[PDB]
Amino acid sequence: QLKLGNSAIVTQEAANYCCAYGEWPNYLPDHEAVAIDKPTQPETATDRFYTLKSVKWETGSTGWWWKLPDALNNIGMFGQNVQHHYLYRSGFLIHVQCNATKFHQGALLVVAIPEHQRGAHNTNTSPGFDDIMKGEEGGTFNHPYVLDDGTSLACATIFPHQWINLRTNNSATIVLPWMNAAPMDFPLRHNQWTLAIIPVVPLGTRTTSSMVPITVSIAPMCCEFNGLRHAIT
Amino acid sequence: AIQTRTVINQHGVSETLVENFLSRAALVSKRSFEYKDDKNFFKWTINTRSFVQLRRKLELFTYLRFDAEITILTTVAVNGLPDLTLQAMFVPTGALTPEKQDSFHWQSGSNASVFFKISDPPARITIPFMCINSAYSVFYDGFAGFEKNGLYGINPADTIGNLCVRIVNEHQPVGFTVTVRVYMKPKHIKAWAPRPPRTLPYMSIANANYKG
Amino acid sequence: AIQTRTVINQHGVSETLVENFLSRAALVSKRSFEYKDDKNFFKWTINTRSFVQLRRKLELFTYLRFDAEITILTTVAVNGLPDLTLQAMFVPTGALTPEKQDSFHWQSGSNASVFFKISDPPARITIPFMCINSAYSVFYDGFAGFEKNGLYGINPADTIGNLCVRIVNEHQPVGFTVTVRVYMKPKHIKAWAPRPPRTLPYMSIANANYKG
Amino acid sequence: GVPTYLLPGSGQFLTTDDHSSAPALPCFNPTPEMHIPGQVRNMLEVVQVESMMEINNTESAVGMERLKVDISALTDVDQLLFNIPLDIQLDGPLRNTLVGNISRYYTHWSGSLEMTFMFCGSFMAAGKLILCYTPPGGSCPTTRETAMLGTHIVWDFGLQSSVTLIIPWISGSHYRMAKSTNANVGYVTCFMQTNLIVPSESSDTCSLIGFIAAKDDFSLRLMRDSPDIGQLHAAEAAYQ
């Protein structure tokens, strides 16, 4: 069972997580408090599973991407804090489970791409604000073989990744550290991670319409924010 | 085609070090300017996205921390060769950039200017780590500003500065064409989060678009 | 305009040291002289009030104690370039100053003359602390003499001297224009009594007038 | 013989290098060092001294009228007296300060500040102010109700006549890609809480003075040339 805060995920198959780049999340260290004034530690409001909407994984699907914290800038206590603060620092605990029967097949690649600067297909203009900031609804890979930035899907297992092969497992869990060059960063302006769930082997069953739902639960870990109140004398 | 084979006998891993993989003095800028009568001087914004050989090699990593070692090789051609003196002024972020050969910014005492002749060994300065993050964001999944014009993939912290190169001399009778070749060698290199190598050809230098 | 922000992560106070704040080789003098047929040589009275960038920066302090490090960069233009020899004679207070290229003061054995070519690296001398007070009075609330002509703000003790630069050669057929750029770097800097920075633009170099 | 070879970078004049050079007059004894008071070893000692803010924010105020806020018995208590945008690099109440001027010789600047507001009415003059601090990326208050919901201080100027107001971690820098500023580092806004209460022999129009200094942790790096001056009669006095 994955219990963070008041939210809980009860499922039987668990405990095979992916500590991303070997680093578990933590708070900002005390010898690096040379940056902006004291980071708060809410510790109960925002460290909880924000379960996103299920996505219909079908045969013709290409992939899904959510950018973090852009997926959570409108949702709840993390969304209230982001739109009132200006700096944040948080790791994430992603739980992606794809519930199918023993007659469905297919493989997902639940990868978490740091600093996924997207490109647009066949133009020389940078992608706009609404092409990248999608919110909770996320996106869909127009070209999943190149991960929409000219790279390769084949080499995308260099990142923190987990495999949902419906023959073997239905869930995946990635635990993301604070992966950034700056100690704290600006949530409404920079998408510090990018969760991406790409098919490699598409879904297939012989019976009626084939459809499986994928559920994404993104819990922020070790949230810090700068401000709210300070002793001015 | 012939098809040979040979017993390879390698032992050691020190050549694939990221210090050894990236510290190569690659050509990062090559444009000429005339010298007669940004007109008639050299101005270049220091970036690694100018040549796709070093661009793809450095876009294997997400973050990079390196001191540049800018070597300026200056050759001159006449439209005989005299001895000319050049000023090569590194303009950091915040300092103002020249617009002419004879502007009042070439005499700024706070910029790092190097004065070198053509008949000397090439000039070489070590630009330090200039970012105000702890690493250069090679890929930046975000925007520079808040909805003002739209600048995707542009980190405000990442900026090295400009390298502005002119000819110190007064105007001479014959006209010259001055080719400036800039050789950056990154050094003291730390590198984080390796990425997939790019498969498709580059379209622009501002973004990561692809033609397919 | 876009409007960005970035987490600045500075730690250390060693860059705002007055040794680091002022020891920059700033351009203090830039005039040319012809060479044909103070006529046809370079004469400059060593002061920091020639360019308002270094003038305002050094007028933050009342007293200053520094060794100058005068770098002379000499470039020549023809009205091909030969190899010319230059003499750059620092004339202290008390020693007599030249009035011609061929005067009998350029051969004074007590002055500090440096002989340098154009085809060399630039000449550089370290002028010591030349004042007969313990510090250079940047601001002098007083007069030089007793009611004789009226000289306000001129300290008699403060005088560095003159830097007199000529061309050692005999007269040649073609005419030259010789641009002399002087780069002073103050060093071993002690500074007393900080002052408000100047807000209004300078009117003269002799005094502290203001237009408002 | 000593076998040498020249490197790229030989015979160049780099302006920001630190090499020894040949003394023009050796065996010249300089004037000995004498104890002159008030030596500055570090420019942050200049920045940490108080200096008056031009807290008036109006264009019609000329000269010394920038330095004060005139409050009186006709002030409509819901009125904002002054807001101080905490941008040092931008024009405003902080551009003409010691923390303002010395930070324009540096590109990146980061640290705490410190405001002091001295009330300069008569001894009998009572009243209140409610000084605020909005963090950057927050909402600058327009009403007094929005003012008392932030990090604020309610200041009665009875016997009290000055408030030291510690501001935490004002940072900022310059950017090129200029057309780039910091958009906010905060505000200090002041609202009339009660009224200005004067006796009938005192003048009704009292005034404030605002000060600002830096703290121990204010820091500066990447020195540049300040644009506050820009270009001289009798400039030929050196070359003649």
Place this chain on the structure above:
Amino acid sequence: GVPTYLLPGSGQFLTTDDHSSAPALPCFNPTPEMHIPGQVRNMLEVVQVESMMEINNTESAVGMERLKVDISALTDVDQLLFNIPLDIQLDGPLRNTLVGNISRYYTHWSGSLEMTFMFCGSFMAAGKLILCYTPPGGSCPTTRETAMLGTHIVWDFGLQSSVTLIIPWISGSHYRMAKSTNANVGYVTCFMQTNLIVPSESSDTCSLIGFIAAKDDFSLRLMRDSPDIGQLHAAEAAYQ
């Protein structure tokens, strides 16, 4: 005076030298080092991570259809599913891998590899494969009888769903005298042993994914420039 003399090789710019050089901005403190996760100190840490092979070997497959082998109930068991030529430098199932791309920055390359084949059918889908390894200079098998006479593994995908397949000492390099390759470093060939047995509610057409990574003893030397990219709109953005 110190008596010196210049050597041949004085005043040359050799691009691959390691000399100190003059700092443009001394007494400039850089931004301090901060612990960023996932540091790479050595490029062989990149190569030793798994990456999908384009095991389809057909020209008609476009895009993501390169990455899988679709096996079904109509497969004629004597058929070769895939052969993987173990040439990294040549085009094929290994050119677009992490071991493939980083070895194209180096001339001579030598070490063991490691293949992982994940079966991605339904849970009920049974069957067998017989994966082989032909050493270089051997005969690549065309029949299943020739397959079971080599270094092979018989893989039932019942509860088992992945096979780690250690490949010993794949080496190779570039040659000039180009018109020169390595001609073989081996093959990994897969044959249907039994059939694909699915239940009637599962889809009959199941798929494989193949992975490849390097081992501890994979090595690279004589760095060169990779030909995988070759030459830009708005390229004038630096010089204007």
Place this chain on the structure above:
Amino acid sequence: GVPTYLLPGSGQFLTTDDHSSAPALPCFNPTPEMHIPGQVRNMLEVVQVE
């Protein structure tokens, strides 16, 4: 090889410098020092005489 580089101020004749220089006649013994009366080591010994 010893990696060197030239500084600004290389190859200049500054008249008031104190460097060693190449002797024109080495292995030439000068005339030995002989005690001559009234040596002046310092010009202030000249000034302090009436």
